[PDB]
Amino acid sequence: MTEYKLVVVGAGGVGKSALTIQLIQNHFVDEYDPTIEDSYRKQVVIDGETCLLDILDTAGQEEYSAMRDQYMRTGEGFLCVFAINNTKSFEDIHHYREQIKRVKDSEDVPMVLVGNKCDLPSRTVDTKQAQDLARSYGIPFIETSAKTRQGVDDAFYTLVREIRKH
Amino acid sequence: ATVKFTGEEKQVDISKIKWVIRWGQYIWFKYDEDAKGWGYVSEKDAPKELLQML
Ligand SMILES: Nc1nc2c(ncn2[C@@H]2O[C@H](COP(=O)(O)OP(=O)(O)NP(=O)(O)O)[C@@H](O)[C@H]2O)c(=O)[nH]1
Ligand SMILES: [Ca+2]
Ligand SMILES: [Ca+2]
Ligand SMILES: [Ca+2]
Ligand SMILES: [Cl-]
Ligand SMILES: [Cl-]
Ligand SMILES: [Cl-]
Ligand SMILES: [Co+2]
Ligand SMILES: [Co+2]
Ligand SMILES: [Co+2]
Ligand SMILES: [Mg+2]
């Protein structure tokens, strides 16, 4: 209720780190590419309540599966990111979700579906596909751009809201 | 220093730790020589020397 542990997950290159840095530094840091996962803290006001986002930006290729799992058990909320020009990233979502559910041994874990890079002149994942998928999960879907900052605060703030209502 | 962590109780010399971060009230680390691996310990259980490497 004061501190929220958020985990950001998704396939390589979807913009997990870009999105996280947009939230933290309020601008688009080009060429930012930590190879190992890293954590970020931010004080924000959400619906009146001041709170601490403790954000884990996961590695594209986590070396230790058990370490991945422990991160998931410890996290309270998950930002599941795909990219709107990468169908593979979007197909991955199904597995991030049930992996997270399996690992936390729970039928209902706070999540938000994020489709990043909506500044791009092309789409391979239709908005209808993502909306239908989110509805079947009973979670919010937010289309974002770490480049233009479109939807970025909204994606993290909505995740906090999903946590508040457990 | 020595870092003690846990499903068994293990220990590693802090001289072998190559990477460490703080997240969600735990301290997360990796270690290696040439044994190689990862571990994690609560923020209130971690040695001063480990906290210093953050
Ligand atoms: N056009 C556009 N490019 C973006 C956007 N977000 C990230 N990118 C670009 O896509 C690439 C991948 O970004 P990155 O933040 O490294 O993604 P990642 O998911 O963190 N990668 P990794 O999983 O390997 O850590 C970079 O070249 C980055 O500049 C976005 O909203 N729009
Ligand atoms: Ca580039
Ligand atoms: Ca739910
Ligand atoms: Ca092991
Ligand atoms: Cl590039
Ligand atoms: Cl899977
Ligand atoms: Cl945009
Ligand atoms: Co909390
Ligand atoms: Co700046
Ligand atoms: Co699967
Ligand atoms: Mg990254």
| Cα A123 to Cα A17: distance, rounded to the nearest angstrom | 21
Query: Residue A80 CA: which ligand is closest?
Result: 1
Pairing of strands A3-10, A49-57: parallel
Print the domain residue range for A31: 1-166
The span from the CA of A140 to the CA of A16, in Å, is: 18
**CB contact, 8 Å: B21 with chain A?**
yes
For A150: left if phi > 0, alpha if psi spans -120 to 50, otherwise beta; the answer is beta
Distance from C-alpha of A76 to C-alpha of B24, rounded to nearest angstrom: 9
Q: Which domains does chain B have, with CATH numbers?
A: 1-54 (2.40.50.40)
Give the whole-angstrom CA distance, residue A75 versus residue B8.
22
Q: DSSP code of A166?
A: -
Contact A111, A155 (CB under 8 A): no
Q: Is there a contact between A147 and A117 (Cβ–Cβ < 8 Å)?
A: yes
Cβ within 8 Å, pair A39-B40: no
A103's tokens? 């690992």
The number of distinct structural domains making up chain A is: 1
> B36 — contact with chain A (CB < 8 Å)?
no
Three-state secondary structure string covering A57-114: ECCCCCCCHHHHHHHHHHCCEEEEEEECCCHHHHHHHHHHHHHHHHHHCCCCCCEEEE
B23 in A contact zone (CB under 8 Å): yes
Sign of CA dihedral A26, A32, B27, A111: positive
* Cβ A52 vs Cβ A42: under 8 Å: yes
- Cα–Cα dist A164/B21, whole Å: 26
Cα torsion A95, A107, A82, A136 to 10°: value is: 100
The CATH number given to whatever domain includes residue A41 is 3.40.50.300
Cβ contacts of A36 on chain B, cutoff 8 Å = 19
Q: How many angstroms separate the alpha carbon of residue B42 from the centre of ligand 10? A: 31
Contact A71, A7 (CB under 8 A): yes
Cα distance between residue A77 and residue A4, in whole Å:
8
How far apart are the CA of A65 and the centre of ligand 4, in A?
Answer: 10
For A131, list phi and psi in degrees, rounded to 5: -65, -45
Candidates B19, B24, B38; nearest CB to A5:
B24
All residues of chain A having their beta carbon less than 8 Å from the beta carbon of residue B28 are: 67
Best CA proximity match to A111, nearest among A137, A77, A154, A76: A77
Burial of A30 (0-12, 13-18, 19+ CB in 10 A): exposed
